[PDB]
Amino acid sequence: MQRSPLEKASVVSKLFFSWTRPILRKGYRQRLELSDIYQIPSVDSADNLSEKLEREWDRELASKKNPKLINALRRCFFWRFMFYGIFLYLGEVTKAVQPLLLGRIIASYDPDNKEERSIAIYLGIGLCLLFIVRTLLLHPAIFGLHHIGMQMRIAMFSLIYKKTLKLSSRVLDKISIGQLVSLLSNNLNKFDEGLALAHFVWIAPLQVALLMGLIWELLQASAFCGLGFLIVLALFQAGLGRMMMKYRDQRAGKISERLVITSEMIENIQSVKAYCWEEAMEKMIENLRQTELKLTRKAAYVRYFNSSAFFFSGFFVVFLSVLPYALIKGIILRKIFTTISFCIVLRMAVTRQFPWAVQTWYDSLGAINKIQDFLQKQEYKTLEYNLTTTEVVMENVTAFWEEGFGELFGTPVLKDINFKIERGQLLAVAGSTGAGKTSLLMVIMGELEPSEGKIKHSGRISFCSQFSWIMPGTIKENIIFGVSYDEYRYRSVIKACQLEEDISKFAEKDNIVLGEGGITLSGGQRARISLARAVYKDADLYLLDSPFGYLDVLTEKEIFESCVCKLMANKTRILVTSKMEHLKKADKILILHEGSSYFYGTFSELQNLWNTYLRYITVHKSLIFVLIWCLVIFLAEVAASLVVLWLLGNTPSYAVIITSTSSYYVFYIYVGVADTLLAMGFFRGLPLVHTLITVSKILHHKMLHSVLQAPMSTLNTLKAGGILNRFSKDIAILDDLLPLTIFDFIQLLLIVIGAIAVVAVLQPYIFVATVPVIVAFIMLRAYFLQTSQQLKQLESEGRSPIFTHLVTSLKGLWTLRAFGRQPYFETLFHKALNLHTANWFLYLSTLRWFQMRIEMIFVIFFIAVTFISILTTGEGEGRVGIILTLAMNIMSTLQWAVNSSIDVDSLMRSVSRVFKFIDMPTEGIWPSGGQMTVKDLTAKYTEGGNAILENISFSISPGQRVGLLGRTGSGKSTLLSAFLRLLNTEGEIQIDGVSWDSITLQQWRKAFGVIPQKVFIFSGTFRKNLDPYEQWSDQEIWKVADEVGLRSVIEQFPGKLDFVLVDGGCVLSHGHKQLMCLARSVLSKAKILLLDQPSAHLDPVTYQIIRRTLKQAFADCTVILCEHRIEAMLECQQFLVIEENKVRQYDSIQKLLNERSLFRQAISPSDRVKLFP
Ligand SMILES: CC(C)(CO)c1cc2cc(NC(=O)C3(c4ccc5c(c4)OC(F)(F)O5)CC3)c(F)cc2n1C[C@@H](O)CO
Ligand SMILES: Nc1ncnc2c1ncn2[C@@H]1O[C@H](COP(=O)(O)OP(=O)(O)OP(=O)(O)O)[C@@H](O)[C@H]1O
Ligand SMILES: Nc1ncnc2c1ncn2[C@@H]1O[C@H](COP(=O)(O)OP(=O)(O)OP(=O)(O)O)[C@@H](O)[C@H]1O
Ligand SMILES: CC(C)CCC[C@@H](C)[C@H]1CC[C@H]2[C@@H]3CC=C4C[C@@H](O)CC[C@]4(C)[C@H]3CC[C@]12C
Ligand SMILES: CC(C)CCC[C@@H](C)[C@H]1CC[C@H]2[C@@H]3CC=C4C[C@@H](O)CC[C@]4(C)[C@H]3CC[C@]12C
Ligand SMILES: CCCCCCCCCCCCCCCCC
Ligand SMILES: CCCCCCCCCCCCCC
Ligand SMILES: CCCCCCCCCCCC
Ligand SMILES: CCCCCCCCCCCC
Ligand SMILES: CCCCCCCCCCCC
Ligand SMILES: CCCCCCCCCCCC
Ligand SMILES: CCCCCCCCC
Ligand SMILES: CCCCCCCCC
Ligand SMILES: [Mg+2]
Ligand SMILES: [Mg+2]
């Protein structure tokens, strides 16, 4: 890409932000292509900012007694912050002194006022220079604040990731994905824009002091009667701001809880559809949203009064200040308007700048102190040797997962374990399910500090987890995992893993871009890729945690005797296996049972013993009625104001002194108080803010409902972080920023329209005088938005790489520390930050260019108007200036209205992106016998893609158990998924004589009982996981738990049937998750059931449970059992062998094994003698 134009630009061009001109010119005619996005400035790269803040934070920890993160920021961002502060203050001083010139010029129109007319010509030049100075002094400061804020946010986001990669093992159970995502999203765009307002904490007191002294000149001692009203208002306003944060802190927990469950269900949406749980998930989320929206409304009601305090202050501040002065001595309209022209600034300084500054300081310091807490949590210690005899030895090791139980010294996970392997002994770990084998490996890696005993080994280690983890990218990226690509070693590993036959089927033959979690791949393909990654890296110790889970006996034997016993014969390798043949070739065998070492020794001695605003308003029927209500009342107030002005001019000592020629001040006075006469009270504001929030409820409900029913092919294209972005950030915008910003835009629009209308009816030339300015505003806005809309979308979509990477890293954290590849993912995360920074910085600069031009055009028109006004005043009664200057006083408010319109349209991008999900396509006693017939079935995942199954035809009888076998990656799960119709299919499969299309899709799916390959467990109670619909009493739940053997594991935890699972059920072992899904299927009594790999890792002793419950509980229902272990084939009668995208049925097992010699020769002897008598 091109270098940033900021590097080499003119100083005059940099001041005016003219370097953003090319992209606006390019972005008006056609769409913005990738070749246009400029590179980030070198002083903005995440690496330099991370290095800087890390160094200061390291020094801060090493020096002070009490470290504070805010202190570390104060040394690397303060000087530029203050340097821009003095320029921002000088911009505000220029604004509070304007009435000394504008009011002195307006008074010159009257012939009776000789004094201020003699010098009016000099004041025109002075006022002209005053406007020009302010334009070059106020905007470049704000952009500097935005630039500093972007640097701070990037530099803090880096340290968040630097700490995340090093978090201790036991703190992960308390820090869920939703906590980080909420932490990032809340500050993702608020922190940068916040710094533009942070300076008014110390600017506003100076503005109040200066203005009060300047008003003291006019109203000698009565000005303080008007100030006391603002002081009471400020105290009341600060009280509401304090109250708002109470409602916002109570909400943080329940929104983080939602963001966890939302991500859990949607990354496993395949299983949710199979279970027909759409309604259950929607109700669960809506119960969480109810309390969240309740707190949002109670916050929004308070924030409305916090916002509207400015508009309902105009008439009162003016009235309460001039009344004690007018009562004692006569007041001239000349001083009434000049007092108004000071209050218009004093009100905004103390009601709209100061409280916003204080609130921003509240928020930013709260976020910094929360990240300071994050940076000081318990950290993974790595105190271990780096050189030794390479002899892995352990002795007297015990461990507890729960910190409190180990602090007291609740069965310990391990007790008194010891072993020793010198330089290549294959130590086969075995035992029953849940006895603890994964924990033994985590103790070795240092993921679980043993309270007692010692463990010694070499530094280099490799790890193949019992649960596969596939990072995004090609197969090659997963295998090498961030090192140099060696051709010879790469081919040898793939050949050893026998991935050649399976990778050859892919279109690109090596490079298929895998989604997060490897959903594109089969169960066994992910397992072998995880194995290949471990094999590729050279290490002293290899921890192979049961890679032979989803593989058939043929591939298991080949991969074991070609990759484990042949490729790495001279490397120590701990292997977790249950097959007896693997213990034969092991030099050491460690049998574990309930954490105790049952046996240790050699096997020999073992044997010896634009249509978006319209649709956003139409989505709710009450919103249009409230808007009409706000318009009807507006017309009444305009009509009342119009007749009041008309009846004062027709009328004729008195307290207020006016002359015939000075009467024109009445209209100038009105413009300064029109904001209060047209202000929306609590009878119009609260209904609008209330109704704008219920729209967000309906939009969220519709969006989640539409997503849950989308076809699977559309769901596989979208990334996990794109979904997480649109649920966290987008919905937060629709609740927090959209309602009140729309209210401000509508309020300002009403004020401008009413002020123009009533003035135009009375003096029908001010409307003509303002048309050339309004048209210029609308024309410039329509030109800028053609590029701002596209820039906003590019930045909005640029947030997804950050969330995908964070989810991927946190899910795979156990593999990262085993390999030691933290720096590789640190620089990869910095690429995502720089990618987001480029679009955000570019958008933020083009917006600043518009803000400068929208003010410059007003300045140009005003300077033009003052000279014609000054020059036209002849021998008294300067009518031309009376009409023109009034026309330009209203545009000082329309400029604010235009800026608010830009903010509304920028935020309306969120609405459109949520609507984009609603439009997604929708894929849309009888089962007495269970007899089904398949005719000419064809299956293919993507439309127009490769046909995984072609013209399949077979039939099964009622009450018949059918086996479904075949080599890994042949199509077994595809065939079982074709029954439920998750992927696009052709043909027909009738049950009991009714066709597919004769019955609705959801009624069809409900006939089946499914056990998916990827066990799904969401955060919640045990009884909620076993039946979300709550249609079973606890008596039946226990009666099933006893039959499936979940008794002992459930009662261990403190809350029996009440324990809240976390991290997708990390507390349970893998074998307990299989039993959990088994109980879930048993409870849902279905006349037909599809079992895809029930006994994934269950040892033969645990398999007795599987065969018992399938024999007893599933008495007469037809079973389609997909299994890999040969012992399971005894039960099923018919066998469906899948190969070459085709299916062929056999009635006897002896014919099946006679056909395939190589299949038969691999069978373990205990199962070979079982099948062959
Ligand atoms: C001079 C003195 C009165 C006493 O030494 C002082 C200076 C000072 C500066 C900062 N913050 C900053 O210079 C930066 C900043 C951080 C966070 C931001 C942000 C700006 O503005 C926001 F509101 F957006 O949050 C630019 C980095 C601060 F926080 C507290 C400070 N104190 C009080 C002292 O007691 C602190 O120890
Ligand atoms: N993170 C954890 N926190 C607390 N308890 C846990 C955790 N992981 C497992 N356990 C519990 O500790 C015991 C053993 O843990 P587990 O990982 O270690 O067995 P395993 O070796 O994976 O079993 P299997 O052979 O069935 O896969 C079980 O009772 C299990 O429920
Ligand atoms: N969503 C998908 N899009 C494209 N191809 C897919 C998709 N899901 C799976 N495949 C491919 O289809 C083939 C078979 O899928 P898969 O269910 O069928 O294997 P399997 O035999 O069920 O696995 P295992 O024996 O490990 O349980 C594989 O080549 C796999 O990569
Ligand atoms: C903190 C800083 C900004 C405070 C500034 C206070 C200034 C604006 C105040 C302080 C004293 C004030 C002056 C006090 C006395 C007089 C004499 C009177 O016949 C005209 C107004 C005039 C000339 C005042 C103008 C405003 C004034 C100069
Ligand atoms: C600058 C001088 C002249 C005027 C006084 C400035 C005001 C705005 C200052 C003085 C004390 C400040 C508060 C001191 C302590 C805290 C707690 C922190 O967790 C959030 C910010 C907060 C709440 C500060 C907000 C701003 C504050 C109220
Ligand atoms: C908070 C607003 C207070 C408004 C009332 C101001 C005080 C009363 C003003 C009139 C005082 C008249 C005094 C006449 C004295 C004759 C010797
Ligand atoms: C919104 C309040 C409007 C008040 C209008 C008062 C009108 C008074 C008319 C007096 C007419 C006198 C004719 C001699
Ligand atoms: C830097 C701030 C200077 C403020 C000077 C204010 C002067 C107000 C006019 C006093 C004489 C009428
Ligand atoms: C930056 C401050 C500028 C103040 C200008 C005040 C000019 C007052 C002139 C009065 C002449 C009668
Ligand atoms: C008698 C002549 C008075 C001239 C007043 C000039 C005021 C200049 C103000 C400049 C502000 C930047
Ligand atoms: C004088 C420097 C600018 C004003 C900054 C005041 C902020 C005080 C915050 C105190 C936090 C403990
Ligand atoms: C905070 C307001 C200060 C006003 C000072 C007025 C001094 C007049 C001599
Ligand atoms: C910008 C054009 C203003 C024209 C004003 C005409 C006033 C006639 C009395
Ligand atoms: Mg395990
Ligand atoms: Mg499968």
Curated annotation (Swiss-Prot):
Changing residue 593 to Q: In CF; strong decrease in bicarbonate transport; increase in chloride channel activity in vitro; no effect on glycan maturation. Changing residue 301 to C: In CF; uncertain significance. Changing residue 533 to T: In CF; impairs maturation and trafficking to the cell membrane; decrease in channel activity. Changing residue 206 to W: In CF and CBAVD. Changing residue 592 to S: In CF; impaired maturation of glycan chains. Changing residue 703 to I: In CF and CBAVD; uncertain significance. A lipid is attached at residues 497, 1117 (S-palmitoyl cysteine). GO terms for cellular component: apical plasma membrane; cell surface; chloride channel complex; clathrin-coated endocytic vesicle membrane; cytoplasm; cytosol; early endosome; early endosome membrane. Belongs to the ABC transporter superfamily. ABCC family. CFTR transporter (TC 3.A.1.202) subfamily. Binds and hydrolyzes ATP via the two cytoplasmic ABC transporter nucleotide-binding domains. The two ATP-binding domains interact with each other, forming a head-to-tail dimer. Normal ATPase activity requires interaction between the two domains. The first ABC transporter nucleotide-binding domain has no ATPase activity by itself. This is Cystic fibrosis transmembrane conductance regulator.
